[PDB]
Design an enzyme around this catalytic site. Structure first.
Site, PDB file in Angstrom:
ATOM      1  N   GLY A 109     -67.589  64.724  -9.105  1.00  0.00           N
ATOM      2  CA  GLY A 109     -66.655  64.483 -10.199  1.00  0.00           C
ATOM      3  C   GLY A 109     -67.089  65.141 -11.499  1.00  0.00           C
TER       4      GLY A 109
ATOM      5  N   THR B  97     -66.426  64.256 -19.567  1.00  0.00           N
ATOM      6  CA  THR B  97     -66.263  65.218 -20.656  1.00  0.00           C
ATOM      7  C   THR B  97     -67.568  65.968 -20.929  1.00  0.00           C
ATOM      8  OG1 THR B  97     -64.287  64.574 -21.817  1.00  0.00           O
ATOM      9  CG2 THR B  97     -66.025  65.390 -23.177  1.00  0.00           C
TER      10      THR B  97
ATOM     11  N   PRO C 183     -56.019  54.723 -12.272  1.00  0.00           N
ATOM     12  CA  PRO C 183     -56.615  54.656 -10.930  1.00  0.00           C
ATOM     13  C   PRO C 183     -57.831  55.550 -10.727  1.00  0.00           C
ATOM     14  CG  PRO C 183     -54.247  54.609 -10.839  1.00  0.00           C
ATOM     15  CD  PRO C 183     -54.595  55.108 -12.233  1.00  0.00           C
ATOM     16  N   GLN C 184     -57.839  56.697 -11.435  1.00  0.00           N
ATOM     17  CA  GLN C 184     -58.911  57.676 -11.397  1.00  0.00           C
ATOM     18  C   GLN C 184     -60.214  57.072 -11.919  1.00  0.00           C
ATOM     19  OE1 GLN C 184     -55.814  58.196 -12.845  1.00  0.00           O
ATOM     20  NE2 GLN C 184     -54.952  59.828 -11.603  1.00  0.00           N
TER      21      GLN C 184
ATOM     22  N   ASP D   1     -58.924  52.988 -21.222  1.00  0.00           N
ATOM     23  CA  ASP D   1     -58.495  54.088 -20.375  1.00  0.00           C
ATOM     24  C   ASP D   1     -58.395  53.592 -18.936  1.00  0.00           C
ATOM     25  OD1 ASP D   1     -57.669  56.693 -19.737  1.00  0.00           O
ATOM     26  OD2 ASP D   1     -59.661  57.563 -19.916  1.00  0.00           O
TER      27      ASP D   1
ATOM     28  N   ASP E 121     -65.905  54.470 -16.059  1.00  0.00           N
ATOM     29  CA  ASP E 121     -65.587  55.375 -17.198  1.00  0.00           C
ATOM     30  C   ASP E 121     -65.342  54.554 -18.465  1.00  0.00           C
ATOM     31  OD1 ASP E 121     -65.526  57.790 -18.511  1.00  0.00           O
ATOM     32  OD2 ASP E 121     -63.906  58.653 -17.300  1.00  0.00           O
TER      33      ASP E 121
ATOM     34  N   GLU F   1     -74.670  52.862  -9.935  1.00  0.00           N
ATOM     35  CA  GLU F   1     -74.545  52.641  -8.507  1.00  0.00           C
ATOM     36  C   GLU F   1     -73.494  53.603  -7.964  1.00  0.00           C
ATOM     37  OE1 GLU F   1     -72.208  49.132  -7.262  1.00  0.00           O
ATOM     38  OE2 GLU F   1     -71.631  48.955  -9.404  1.00  0.00           O
ATOM     39  N   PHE F   2     -73.744  54.193  -6.790  1.00  0.00           N
ATOM     40  CA  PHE F   2     -72.728  55.018  -6.162  1.00  0.00           C
ATOM     41  C   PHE F   2     -71.616  54.166  -5.538  1.00  0.00           C
ATOM     42  CE2 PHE F   2     -70.992  57.218  -2.385  1.00  0.00           C
ATOM     43  CZ  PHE F   2     -70.429  58.298  -3.036  1.00  0.00           C
ATOM     44  N   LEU F   3     -70.363  54.527  -5.831  1.00  0.00           N
ATOM     45  CA  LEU F   3     -69.173  54.119  -5.084  1.00  0.00           C
ATOM     46  C   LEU F   3     -68.448  55.318  -4.457  1.00  0.00           C
ATOM     47  CD1 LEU F   3     -69.344  52.021  -7.827  1.00  0.00           C
ATOM     48  CD2 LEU F   3     -67.678  50.916  -6.356  1.00  0.00           C
TER      49      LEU F   3
HETATM   50 BR1  LIG Z   1     -69.427  56.803  -8.244  1.00  0.00          BR
HETATM   51  C1  LIG Z   1     -69.298  57.219 -10.081  1.00  0.00           C
HETATM   52  C2  LIG Z   1     -69.933  56.592 -11.100  1.00  0.00           C
HETATM   53  C3  LIG Z   1     -69.682  57.061 -12.390  1.00  0.00           C
HETATM   54  N1  LIG Z   1     -68.872  58.085 -12.674  1.00  0.00           N
HETATM   55  C4  LIG Z   1     -68.235  58.723 -11.639  1.00  0.00           C
HETATM   56  N2  LIG Z   1     -67.425  59.771 -11.949  1.00  0.00           N
HETATM   57  C5  LIG Z   1     -66.812  60.363 -10.943  1.00  0.00           C
HETATM   58  C6  LIG Z   1     -66.940  60.010  -9.582  1.00  0.00           C
HETATM   59  C7  LIG Z   1     -67.758  58.991  -9.258  1.00  0.00           C
HETATM   60  C8  LIG Z   1     -68.430  58.315 -10.303  1.00  0.00           C
END
Ligand SMILES: Brc1ccnc2ncccc12
Ligand SMILES: Brc1ccnc2ncccc12
Ligand SMILES: Brc1ccnc2ncccc12
EC number: 2.7.11.22
Lengths: 262, 299
Positions: free
Chosen positions: B14, B17, B133-134, B130, B148, B84-86
């Protein structure tokens, strides 16, 4: 309505009360600073008051900056020649946190009279962020004041402006306001303002919200009341100058009361 | 508490900015993380205000429905946020959930969690500003979390004037579009409202191409507001009497597949008047959620 967040105001107040204890400076740090004094800090704070006026900055920003300075000076020994660099970096960080349009870094360099470089200011910014570990969402006297204000019946802009003024005076003198929490100074300020303008006292309703009574505020009140009486003579005068302005209903021109009657 | 030598980059996932987001792996614990690099060497104004708010606000918000900031690596020319990763965001999922559609249990689970996360935000004086869904991250366990927080802001009570024209347009509340002096927690609720509808339909409810087209789309669905439905509206800085006056269509036409309970909740999320619009805290008790669970995503 929703601008006063009725479903969240209690939660918020409770949360700020907890956070003010965590964001608290060490009451005795000046004595452990070898090269700086309450008087040097007063000069600095009074200058930051003037800087906020020049850049038309929120009062909240000023309060944040002082919170940052005091916390920083609590763990970091600082030569007097560098005291102002810390305060500049503090005011930049507060501005980036709180303001819609912070002044540019060059402007912060400029208000220091080229005592410091842009490189010095940006390097101190990283240091304050490291020392504070980015914990910048600190409760201020103002965040309590604005909630206390909702209890006025009815609302008085002179009460509000005069409370802002008093709380602001307290930033200037570490002795004795470092010993008191934001929430307790805001309570002293609100009561002293209310009493001065309307004759009324800390309301039952704020006793319920805060748990504070005139019994528990009495120490800060006696100090704040002295600070108010003596404010025309204080060596620092920027706050008084500031509160002459109509923006603040010229509250610095009101006469303090001679006595509080408990 | 951490250092970049114990992380192994895996792939780009991803962009924000201030740079790219990376999936990485902690080589000592096994933990999978997202690294957000913030450019500082290129930064001539120092640490960005976005980052200062993002990091300061996120360090305080420990909730299962808010993305967790694990660490901040402060090098001299680089700043790394470790989250944390999602696996995915809600937008990707909605696009991949087409033809079948998102199952109601999962719509209901996700909305419920979103409200829990937002309520926790609002309870810690934090507007997200903000929600879209993104910016909502889902995992393989059924969790959804607000992410975010770069446009987020610590509020005081009552609120003062903050930055205008915040929130991605398709999700912006009418009181921002009308240039109101003050906005509050109700703007985030509006966004979740749009998102609720969006999860059901898999398409944006008000897809405008301008501020005025956005207003007009809203008005054509909820009816043009007047002093009865929304006292003050005709005084707002960018209210104009020349606004066309559209009838409120019956709310079962806005989202036809929605049941009575869903409609009730959606209507309360999209109330014009920010004072009557439901709070995240109140919404949690709404009968729409009487049978809610936390099922895994179907894909
Ligand atoms: Br997972 C995660 C955490 C924080 N920011 C992110 N930005 C884009 C995609 C995944 C993210
Ligand atoms: Br009664 C009561 C309890 C707690 N908080 C309150 N705030 C305002 C007015 C009354 C309150
Ligand atoms: Br969670 C939950 C459980 C049972 N009933 C409920 N009703 C409304 C909202 C949430 C509910």
């Amino acid at each position: 309505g929703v601008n006063e967040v009725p479903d969240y105001h209690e939660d918020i107040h409770t949360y700020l009360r907890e956070m003010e204890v965590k964001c608290k400076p060490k009451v005795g740090y000046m004595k452990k600073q070898p090269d700086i004094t309450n008087s040097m800090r007063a000069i600095l704070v009074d200058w930051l008051v003037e800087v906020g006026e020049e850049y038309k900055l929120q009062n909240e920003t000023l309060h944040l900056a002082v919170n940052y300075i005091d916390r920083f000076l609590s763990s970091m020994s600082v030569l007097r020649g560098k005291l102002q660099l810390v305060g500049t970096a503090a005011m930049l960080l507060a501005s980036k946190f709180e303001e819609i349009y912070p002044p540019e870094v060059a402007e912060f360099v400029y208000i220091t009279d080229d005592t410091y470089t842009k490189k010095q200011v940006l390097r101190m910014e990283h240091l304050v962020l490291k020392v504070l570990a980015f914990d910048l969402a600190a409760p201020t006297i103002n965040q309590f004041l604005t909630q206390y204000f909702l209890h006025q019946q009815p609302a008085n802009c002179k009460v509000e402006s005069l409370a802002m003024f008093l709380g602001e005076l307290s930033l200037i003198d570490a002795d004795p306001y470092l010993k008191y929490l934001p929430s307790v100074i805001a309570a002293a300020a609100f009561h002293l303002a209310l009493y001065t303008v309307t004759g009324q006292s800390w309301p039952e309703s704020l006793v319920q919200k805060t748990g504070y009574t005139l019994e528990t505020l009495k120490p800060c009140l006696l100090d704040l009341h002295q600070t108010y009486l003596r404010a025309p003579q204080h060596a620092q005068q920027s706050i008084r100058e500031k509160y002459k302005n109509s923006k603040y209903h010229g509250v610095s021109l009101l006469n303090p009361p001679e006595t509080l009657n408990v | 508490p951490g250092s970049m030598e114990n992380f192994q980059k895996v792939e780009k996932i991803g962009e924000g900015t201030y740079g790219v987001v990376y999936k990485a792996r902690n080589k000592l614990t096994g933990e999978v993380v997202a690294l957000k690099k913030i450019r500082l060497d290129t930064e001539t104004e120092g640490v960005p205000s976005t980052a200062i708010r993002e990091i300061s606000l996120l360090k305080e918000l420990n909730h299962p429905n808010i993305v967790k900031l694990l660490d901040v690596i402060h090098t001299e020319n680089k700043l790394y946020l470790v989250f944390e990763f999602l696996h995915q965001d809600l937008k990707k999922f909605m696009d991949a959930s087409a033809l079948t559609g998102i199952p109601l249990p999962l719509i209901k689970s996700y909305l419920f969690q979103l409200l829990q996360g937002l309520a926790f935000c609002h309870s810690h004086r934090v507007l997200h500003r903000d929600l879209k869904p993104q910016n909502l991250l889902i995992n393989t366990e059924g969790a959804i979390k607000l992410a975010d927080f770069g446009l987020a802001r610590a509020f005081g009570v009552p609120v003062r004037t903050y930055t205008h024209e915040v929130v991605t347009l398709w999700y912006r509340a009418p009181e921002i579009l009308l240039g109101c002096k003050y906005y509050s927690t109700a703007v985030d609720i509006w966004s979740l409202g749009c998102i609720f509808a969006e999860m059901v339909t898999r398409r944006a409810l008000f897809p405008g191409d301008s501020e005025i087209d956005q207003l007009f789309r809203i008005f054509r669905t909820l009816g043009t507001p007047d002093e009865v439905v929304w006292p003050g509206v005709t005084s707002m800085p960018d209210y104009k009497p020349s606004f066309p006056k559209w009838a409120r269509q019956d709310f079962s036409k806005v989202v036809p597949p929605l049941d009575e309970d869903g409609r009730s909740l959606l209507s309360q999320m999209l109330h014009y008047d920010p004072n009557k619009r439901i709070s995240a805290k109140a919404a949690l008790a709404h009968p729409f959620f009487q049978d809610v669970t936390k099922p895994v995503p179907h894909l």
